[PDB]
From a paper:
The [name] [name] (SmTGR) (EC 1.8.1.9) is a homodimeric flavoprotein with a head-to-tail orientation between monomers. Like all mammalian TR, SmTGR is a selenoprotein carrying the amino acid selenocysteine (Sec597). Paired with Cys596, this residue directly participates in enzymatic catalysis together with FAD and at least two other cystine pairs (Cys28-S–S-Cys31 and Cys154-S–S-Cys159) with redox activity.
In this work, we describe the unprecedented screening of a poised library of 768 molecular fragments against SmTGR using X-ray crystallography. Among the 768 fragments used in the crystallography-based screening, a set of 35 fragments were identified as hits.
Residue numbers in the entry:
A (entry chain B): 6 to 593
B (entry chain A): 6 to 514, 516 to 593
């Protein structure tokens, strides 16, 4: 029924007004609340299909059936006359601030999702605290508010990716008639790092301002859920206390793993350290083969570093393997070396990091290949990118009763709820969800709208598009080719594909047949597009809009009947015709 | 119903075979035709939903109801025994070349649409000729096969744009840590033009190879339609002759206009001349305000030139006017000067063009502003971008009966047919269609499939997306904002909008110049009627969304899709400020 919607809304909301748009009785209660510096949500009943039934159900609480009606934290406050009887008597602040807990909402985690949920909750009148603390890395690195993307993730990595792209810009400029000689131009690592850290510092500051201007309490404190409604916090001075909240959101993210081998923690670094490193890495070994490892190797080479990637098995496990091979081939051709089917055994120190003179150390790496032969080479810097994990034992006492999966992530329902009914989890620690910043933001915002404004919208987690920012970018939306075959059978999968060449590469004398795209389609379902894949420049900008068409169920015919924009790389999707079954070449 | 399809299909097809995939007798006839190099179309009756009706209806032509049946130019040739008999007896080649006309298809015009139409028809066995001739510009400029885009349009204009974009990329490089100093780097015009002309030459060559390998006859001759089936050709040696064809496609495009003022033809140039000009233009006056005018003024500025645009009234007439003003404001902050509400009266010559030393001349331009005040300035080069027109009197005798609208364009039904039943028109001269290269290509290809392979798919001309390649690009798909209010009323229109800033612009040091909006319809589930974005890589951004708009996308379809981070395009997935709210769109 409607009755248990209405009654979840009233129960959970902080301050909420049931109202209508034509009623000037409601319009005067609003203006009172605005000037009184009171935030609230507002269900306009004349714009809901079944506003009539809701008016009746309000009477179960208030014994009346008209509008406006104001509730605070589950209790009916009054109608239009009673609100002004409280206002002019100056009894209104004591009533709107009445609560069994310190906060309506405590977010443990000040990253992508944490800050996004906190700000949206506060819009609708919820008393909100946001906790953030950055445990330092083994060598001591630390940073400010905003989470992993803002400080040591998407933002600093794409900015260094852009710095790497601009070396090809300097090469190309010669052929388009500019008088520079790229031969005599070199890169300065620490000038880059200063500009990058300057931008991050402005996001740190901007988030503190945003929280302040939304009346959100920010505590730079480590938090721990000790009971369903109690969060124990620790100061920067080591002072412990306890705060209480009605709803809890866990949004604490992950940190990089190290392999269990001698020397790794003591002498290597991870991505957490790379984006503010005060010396150029020098001769670098990257261990691992995820998108983090290949993206960092890619711009290290483009800035002129001597870069090696040690690969256990394959590149980009979980991604379309034909495209992953195309990515790796391009990198191998443009400076990155690979040591294939190889694994490390220990890291030995030969020289200590020189802090005063700003120089890396010197390390000796010992490893072995799957056949048996030995790996032994010296590097100045060794970077581990062997995956990320959460440490929920630090965040969450086991007696609270929040269930975790065998990987240590939180098992949630489809509306982010944990096994404890007032506790939710969003972002990287939610089991089974894609680990991406815009996913966490969308989840956090939609959930706050459900707890405090009566919203029903859920987050849709399927067919979320991605881009890997390797020297040649790789964008994808949907199934990889081998997953669609495995799920529907090779006879039911048709794949259209083609090479291409950006117009911008013609005068520049770049390669003819390295850029590549394909559509993986289901025959028996009107050639429905199951996955889209593209290797080339600006692959993120290319892929993104097609994610809407695929969310709507696009078919091959939908692509055929749409006309291209000329000249672009993206238009090549609108005229594809060569099937893989056919055996015809895809070259240009 | 099905009946009238199969009679239209049999009459216009050149060589066509009706068959079934599972039939070894049809396979036997296919294998004979491959070996004899006899190109043909093929209808596979067992993959069509009314193949049974078609099968019975073939008997009205062939007095049989079995497959495989082969036709040539409206005549039943036989079943598998009759065809093999012809093969074995050496009679099959003469039968399949029997024609009342010289060609199954004559295309007049070897540009974007004509080449696409020509190459596609040949795949189905049509005996095809393609005609192309380039009348020179007033100063003598001419070029090779491929049309306006390939030679004096999209392809050279975007390479030159690209040259201009690299100048800001050299600036940005310093801030991201590269040692270069932008201040001591300069641009060589003739080096660029050589690289551009070299790529165009490779396209000229590749199209000639393409026509050769499809057995299309290429005649570098001017063609004129003198009767429904007769095309008069004139040689590069002025030899005149007449060829005949069953179906005629007109695809002759347009050329730039000149204003009727003294000195304009004698001392100015147009875009036709600019992309192969041997000298740098110098101080340039661009007259006009279309996307050609603004794109060219744009890269000439970025390459270091002193550039002025003379605007009669507004910029980008017919495009969303708020977006056009943003496009022009950005150009004005980055070098381009504007002479607003202004029109030219005459061009006077001060220095002739110096061919020996490779230098432009010198000109005095006189004009007036709308209030009467006078304009008088000196420039080395004057570029007219005051529109384009067909000249179908050069193409089409009046007595053939092909009807034209009041602009001289061809009035066509929604299958590209003219008032004469064997004559079709495609591309720029098709009245009322967006004048774009992918549109011409799609129309020429789809039409050839209907004339010669029994296809029925029409070309969809609605909601075709565009990009204007100004220094900051402007992508668009669907109705402008003012157009949508005119059609549905202000109360039924919601506009969501936001400024944004590329991540690449942060370390490189404007905050709120990039902009995008969605124009929606309240009473139709908030249906997206127009998408607009100003920013970098706007074509790459806009294109994919054109599929979702074609499928009828709403605001909720945009909200429920997750973004790709960090990108510019992802800002479309989280828009929330409305124009009626009065809230500011900056970030
Ligand atoms: C190198 C790298 C590059 C990436 N690039 C991209 C990209 O291009 N695009 C993309 O979409 N995603 C990218 N990601 C993934 C993206 O960063 C994550 O999906 C996202 O940051 C997860 O958000 P979150 O809110 O769940 O966690 P986080 O952003 O990690 O925020 C959690 C915060 O809570 C803090 N915290 C932890 N424990 C406690 C505690 N007990 N008390 C208080 N605070 C605590 C953490 O220190 C942190 O500040 C990248 C990740 C990495 C590592
Ligand atoms: C500066 C500029 C930039 C442009 N940029 C873009 C862009 O970025 N994207 C886009 O989509 N569109 C762009 N266009 C438009 C695009 O060029 C046209 O839409 C396209 O060329 C139309 O093709 P068409 O086949 O109709 O004609 P055309 O390509 O003009 O082909 C006509 C051909 O027929 C020849 N011909 C004429 N008369 C005869 C005759 N009697 N006998 C034989 N041959 C004859 C002509 O000389 C020419 O070779 C641009 C146009 C210009 C001028
Ligand atoms: C539990 O760690 C104590 C803390 N140190 N710095 C903070 N900001 S909180
Ligand atoms: C998830 O696998 C982590 C690793 N990758 N490369 C290694 N050598 S260990
Ligand atoms: C009037 O034009 C005669 C020509 N015909 N084809 C050429 N190449 S010159
Ligand atoms: C034929 O000329 C008409 C014009 N169009 N734009 C101008 N500035 S003058």
């Amino acid at each position: 029924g409607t009755s248990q919607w209405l009654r979840k809304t009233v129960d959970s909301a902080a301050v909420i007004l049931f109202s209508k748009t034509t009623c000037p009785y409601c319009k005067k209660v609003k203006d009172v609340l605005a000037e009184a510096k009171i935030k609230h949500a507002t269900i306009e009943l004349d714009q809901l299909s079944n506003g009539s039934a809701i008016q009746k159900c309000l009477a179960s609480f208030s014994k009346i059936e008209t509008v406006p009606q104001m509730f605070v934290r589950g209790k009916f406050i009054g109608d239009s006359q009673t609100v002004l009887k409280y206002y002019s008597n100056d009894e209104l602040a004591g009533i709107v601030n009445e609560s069994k807990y310190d906060y309506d909402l405590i977010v443990i985690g000040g990253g992508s999702g944490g800050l996004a949920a906190g700000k949206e909750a506060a819009k609708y009148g919820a008393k909100t605290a946001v906790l953030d603390y950055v445990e330092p890395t083994p060598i001591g690195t630390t940073w400010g508010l905003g989470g992993t993307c803002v400080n040591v993730g998407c933002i600093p990595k794409k900015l260094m990716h852009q710095a790497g792209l601009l070396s090809h810009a300097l090469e190309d400029a010669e052929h388009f008639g500019w008088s520079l000689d790229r031969s005599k131009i070199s890169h300065n690592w620490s000038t880059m790092v200063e500009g990058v850290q300057s931008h991050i510092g402005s996001l740190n500051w901007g988030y503190k301002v945003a929280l302040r201007d939304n009346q959100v309490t920010y505590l730079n404190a480590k938090g721990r859920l000790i009971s369903p409604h109690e969060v124990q916090i620790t100061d920067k001075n080591q002072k412990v206390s306890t705060i209480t909240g009605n709803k809890i959101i866990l949004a604490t993210g992950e940190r990089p793993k190290y392999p269990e081998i001698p020397g790794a923690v003591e002498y290597g670094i991870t991505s957490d350290d790379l984006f503010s490193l005060p010396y150029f890495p020098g001769k670098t070994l990257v261990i691992g083969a995820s998108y983090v490892a290949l993206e960092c190797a890619g711009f290290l080479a483009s800035l002129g570093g001597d870069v090696t990637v040690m690969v256990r098995s394959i590149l980009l496990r979980g991604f379309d393997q034909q495209m992953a091979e195309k990515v790796g081939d391009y990198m191998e051709n443009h400076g990155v070396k690979f040591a294939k089917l190889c694994v490390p055994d220990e890291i030995k120190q030969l020289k200590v990091v020189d802090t005063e003179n700003n120089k890396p150390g010197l390390l000796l790496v010992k490893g072995h290949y799957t056949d048996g032969k030995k790996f032994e080479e010296e590097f100045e810097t060794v970077i581990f990118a062997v995956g990320r994990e959460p440490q929920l034992s630090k965040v969450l006492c086991e007696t609270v009763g929040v269930k975790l999966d065998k990987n240590g992530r939180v098992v949630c329902t489809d509306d982010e709820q944990t096994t404890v009914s007032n506790v939710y989890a969003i972002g990287d620690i939610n089991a089974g969800k894609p680990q991406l910043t815009p996913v966490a933001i969308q989840a956090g915002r939609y959930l706050a709208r459900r707890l405090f404004a009566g919203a029903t919208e859920l987050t849709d987690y399927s067919n979320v598009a991605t881009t890997v920012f390797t020297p040649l970018e790789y964008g994808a939306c949907g199934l990889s080719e081998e997953d669609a075959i495995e799920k529907y059978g090779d006879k039911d999968i048709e794949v259209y594909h083609s090479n291409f060449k950006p117009l911008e590469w013609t005068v520049a004398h770049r390669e003819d047949n390295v850029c590549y795209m394909k559509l993986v389609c289901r025959k028996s379902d009107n050639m429905r597009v199951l996955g889209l894949h593209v290797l080339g420049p600006n692959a993120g900008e290319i892929t993104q809009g097609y994610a809407v068409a695929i969310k709507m169920g696009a078919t091959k015919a939908d692509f055929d009947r749409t006309i291209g924009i000329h000249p672009t790389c993206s238009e090549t999707f609108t005229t594809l015709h060569v099937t893989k079954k056919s055996g015809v070449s895809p070259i240009v």
